[PDB]
Amino acid sequence: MRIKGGKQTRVRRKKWLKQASGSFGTRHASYKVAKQTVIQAAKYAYRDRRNKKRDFRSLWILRLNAALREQGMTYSVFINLLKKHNIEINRKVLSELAIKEPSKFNLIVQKVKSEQPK
Amino acid sequence: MKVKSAAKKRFKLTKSGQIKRKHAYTSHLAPHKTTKQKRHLRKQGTVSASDFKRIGNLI
């Protein structure tokens, strides 16, 4: 019983080739280089999911910090005032407010500024 | 498989599968051993657990 390989190797090889579509030259043509690039690209994608979670937080912090410095308050004290006033809002939504709704963002800063903590 | 001719003539089996054996240092040079040592080595013994597996497949 001589089992002969055909359509088994080609199908699993073409899967890797399909994933590595859009690469530079041989990196999409040859199966070997395509397989290596897909594995490396998967590693990159894994690492950058974690790094995206951190980098977007940093960008929100930067935007929020800038928006406060125009009013004379700093980021380090703005978050402290937020905690003492029990207000719980993401820096993402707060930055979205300062870019989309300047008046309502200014309302939040006014209350945290001076109103009695709790 | 053939039973080793040296494994036999030196290892006898028992009811529960223990492999009986004879103590060594009982061939010559008697004055270099004490009578306590000689009378303790006269009695027979069994292979230890470290060798039981190696002798089971040898027999």
């Binding site: - | 004879k22 060594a24 190696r54 497949n57």
Partner: protein, 150 residues
Amino acid sequence: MELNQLKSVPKARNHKTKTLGRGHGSGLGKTSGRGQKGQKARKSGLTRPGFEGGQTPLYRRLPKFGNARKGFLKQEWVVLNLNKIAKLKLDKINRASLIEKQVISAKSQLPIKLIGHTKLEKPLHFEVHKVSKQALKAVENANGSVKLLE
């Protein structure tokens, strides 16, 4: 069960076959369980049984047993044991009676020996070449008898 749906009892037919060459996903790829670059990982095999790497093996270290009856064979005996003979159903136990019951082969001339201590209730009449003193005591403590063939 039909021929188009036939099934074995669970955990009786199929067991995990350890394939040693088909990929690392099975945990048995590349090296295939031999280890790494040593004697046990080559095609030769696992040396010799009983070997100890040059140190004198255990059998070569221990004295040889002695055979007093050199070149002889122990005389085999057919032994009737008292603890189990009660379970067997027969009276006047002689050589001929054992043949129909097929305890002894009709093409065998081995001498019959009586052995045992367990008390028996009904009496039996043995025809034995040899009998123990206390086995005879037990048999004759009941209403049985024993004759010693010569």
